[PDB]
Amino acid sequence: SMFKLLLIFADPAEAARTLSLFPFSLNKENFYTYHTENVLLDVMVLKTWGYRGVVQALSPPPSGYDLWINAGFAGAANPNIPLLKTYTITSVKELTPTTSVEEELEVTPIPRLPLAQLTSVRSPYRDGFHEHLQLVDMEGFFIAKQASLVACPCSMIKVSSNYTTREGQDFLKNNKVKLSQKLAEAIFPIYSSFIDV
């Protein structure tokens, strides 16, 4: 199966509806795989246990794929971002709040999705709304940087899951199925594009 596509989700809730789209199996390496025609589709979920993801979830980075897609939920830190909307990311910044030091990497935009910028922070933003932030997640920068180590292109799909306030967290808690479904709906046409018949 010539074209090899790795899908990376931060947690099981994000992955759930994509894992329903295809008849995946768990392989002996303990992750999900499916193949048809020329396409291999693998899925990794970074945090299935515990209170935090660990660096060894993607270290050493998986080798041999032709594309990685990180699909996940992201908070909206600007009120002009509606919720339940799927974006593709142009660049992702890691931000360290205690020092204000940032790093930033470009990521490969997916066709036909609207563009957005992503900031990744270790602790979820409940800080309210910020003039200079759009979407906010936890794992995007980590994944893009790991992709750079194997020279593999990386794309991101992020669905706006909640506003970045205390009161806004309930929407994330209560809409995980709808949000995961949006990710699945965005992944499918990408997978379809790489079928070479």
Query: For binding to its own copies (CB under 8 A), which residues are involved?
Result: 17, 20-23, 36, 177-178, 181, 184-185, 188-189, 192
State which residue, 127 or 185, has the beta carbon closest to its own copies: 185
State which residue, 23 or 50, has the beta carbon closest to its own copies: 23
* Among candidate residues 9, 138, 136, 134, the one with its CA nearest the CA of residue 68: 9
C-alpha to C-alpha distance for 7 and 143, rounded to whole angstroms: 11
Contacts of 30 (CB under 8 A, 6+ apart): none
Question: Could you tell me if 3 and 36 are in contact, meaning their C-beta atoms sit under 8 angstroms apart?
Answer: no
Least Å distance, CB 22 to its own copies, is: 7
Strand pairing category for 135-137 and 115-120: parallel
Least Å distance, CB 187 to its own copies, is: 10
Least Å distance, CB 91 to its own copies, is: 26
Question: Could you tell me if 75 and 139 are in contact, meaning their C-beta atoms sit under 8 angstroms apart?
Answer: no
State which residue, 52 or 173, has the beta carbon closest to its own copies: 173
State which residue, 84 or 149, has the beta carbon closest to its own copies: 84
Least Å distance, CB 15 to its own copies, is: 14
State which residue, 39 or 154, has the beta carbon closest to its own copies: 39
What is the 3-class SS of 109-162, one letter each residue? CCCCCCEEEEEECCCCCCCCCCCCCCEEECCHHHHHHHHHHCCCCEEEEEEEEE
Least Å distance, CB 134 to its own copies, is: 20
